[PDB]
């Protein structure tokens, strides 16, 4: 048999006893290692600008709807001056204490859409809502005053 | 007049012992090819050498003469040079006539000289 072969040639036993003694032995520690101890900053300006400016904010569960009809529910408030905003709860939920909204905080879980304005139409919006018998409106806030879905009936009538 | 080829496939080459014209080498040797054609029915054997590297490459040369008669017929390059090279035997026995006729005209004129 030659020196360079097609197959891995067997070694001598004194060689193979040496290729066992000089194997790589890794360091083993005392204690195992693991067993021991712009996009946001612009939206850190915008919801702060939502709450400086707006008067009536309305929050909801708007993931409920189709690709055409959510453009339409956008357009059904386009005929007023109501605009509808979506924001990340990873950046909207910490702001609420920076604008001191305690009773609006245990309110933002899941998909949530603000429905801001400066004058309420929402007397007619519930009539627009009366043909989609889901999509329920939750608690709003006008000028540091919460208003629930009952609070949007006591004022809006 | 080339002999039309044969594919690399469709050739059931068996390898048997075959005829044995020898003492002990030729009973145990699978030297005889049985190179077949699958399409036609043309079965060719060969024990031409004591080696398949000249058996099989010459068995192929015989088969491309036999299956040539199948796809051409009696007008083929395998019968052209049977009727062209036995054309000469009518130009060899007729040639040999006309000189064994003029070898009596010169043999009777011989010795009828005086």
């Amino acid at each position: 048999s030659k020196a360079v072969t097609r197959h891995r040639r067997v070694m001598h036993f004194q060689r193979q006893k040496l290729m066992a003694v000089t194997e790589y032995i890794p360091p083993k520690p005392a204690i195992h290692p693991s067993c021991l101890p712009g996009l946001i900053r612009l939206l850190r300006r915008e919801i702060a600008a939502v709450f400086q400016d707006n008067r009536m904010i309305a929050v909801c569960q708007n993931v409920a709807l189709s690709a055409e009809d959510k453009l339409l529910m956008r357009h059904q408030l386009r005929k007023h001056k109501i605009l509808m905003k979506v924001f990340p709860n990873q950046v909207l939920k910490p702001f609420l204490e920076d604008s001191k909204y305690q009773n609006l905080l245990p309110l933002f879980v899941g998909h949530n859409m603000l429905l801001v304005s400066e004058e309420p139409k929402v007397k007619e919006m519930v009539r627009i809502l009366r043909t989609v018998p889901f999509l329920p409106l939750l608690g709003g806030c006008i000028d540091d005053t919460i208003l629930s879905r009952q609070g949007f009936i006591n004022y809006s009538k | 007049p080339a002999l039309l080829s044969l594919d690399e496939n469709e050739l059931e080459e068996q390898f048997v012992k075959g005829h044995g014209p020898g003492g002990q080498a030729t009973n145990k040797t699978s030297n005889c090819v049985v190179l077949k054609h699958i399409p036609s029915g043309i079965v060719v054997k060969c024990h031409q050498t004591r080696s398949v590297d000249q058996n099989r490459k010459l068995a192929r040369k015989i088969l491309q003469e036999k299956v040539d008669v199948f796809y051409n017929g009696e007008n083929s390059p395998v019968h052209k040079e049977k009727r062209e090279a036995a054309k000469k035997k009518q130009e060899r026995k007729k040639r040999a006539k006309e000189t064994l006729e003029k070898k009596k005209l010169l043999k009777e004129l011989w010795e009828s000289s005086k």
Binding site: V4, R8, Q14, T22, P26 | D53
Partner: protein, 205 residues
């Protein structure tokens, strides 16, 4: 020409004097084409072997098929086949001379870069089709990057200092400790146990 060019079977001047099977062009680390020149991705040889002309059409036809020649380009880092390899006409007894020249072959040592790639693309665009090219080579091969060739070098250099074994191969082989050079080759003083024939072992510190 932004593709792998055609590599011919034989040298244009055919080699007419026969050569010995000088098998120490397979054995050991490579000395030519170990580093990157004009590229970012390549196929490192983790073992020695001989590239016949069929491997050169394995490599060229399956790189020009799976590649954007507008955006990527490729370059041979081995030469065309030059080393003549004989074969005797079959059926013969031994002896009677050397055989006639059959075909040619290129010797590739371990650590050699074989085919280099480049252009505008990430490694993950090229790691796809190059790893399957590398598995059909006659040796162990591998797609590397510029970044993953140094990551394979600095990690293996880390393994030399990190290991807690007092006895390395290179210390026993040069000091001739147990009379061990009776068994070893004279090249194991310089191979240092990472090579055995044409095979390269990277699990050996």
């Amino acid at each position: 020409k932004p593709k792998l060019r055609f590599i011919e079977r034989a040298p244009l001047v055919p080699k007419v004097r026969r050569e010995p099977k000088n098998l120490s062009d397979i054995r050991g680390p490579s000395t030519e084409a170990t580093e990157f020149t004009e590229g970012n991705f390549a196929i490192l040889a983790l073992g020695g072997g001989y590239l016949h002309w069929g491997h050169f059409e394995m490599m060229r036809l399956t790189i020009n098929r799976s590649m954007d020649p507008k955006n990527m380009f490729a370059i041979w880092r081995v030469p065309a086949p030059f080393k003549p390899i004989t074969r005797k006409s079959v059926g013969h007894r031994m002896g009677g001379g050397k055989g006639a020249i059959d075909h040619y072959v290129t010797p590739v040592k371990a650590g050699r870069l074989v085919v280099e790639m480049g252009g505008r693309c990430e490694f993950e665009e090229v790691q796809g089709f190059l790893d399957q090219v590398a598995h059909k080579l006659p040796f162990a091969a591998k797609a590397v990057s510029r970044g993953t060739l140094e990551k394979m070098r600095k990690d293996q250099e880390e393994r030399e200092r990190n290991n807690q074994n007092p006895w390395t191969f290179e210390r026993i082989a040069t000091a001739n400790m147990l009379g061990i050079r009776k068994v070893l080759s004279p090249y194991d003083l310089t191979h240092k146990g990472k090579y055995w024939g044409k095979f390269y072992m990277p699990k050996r510190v």
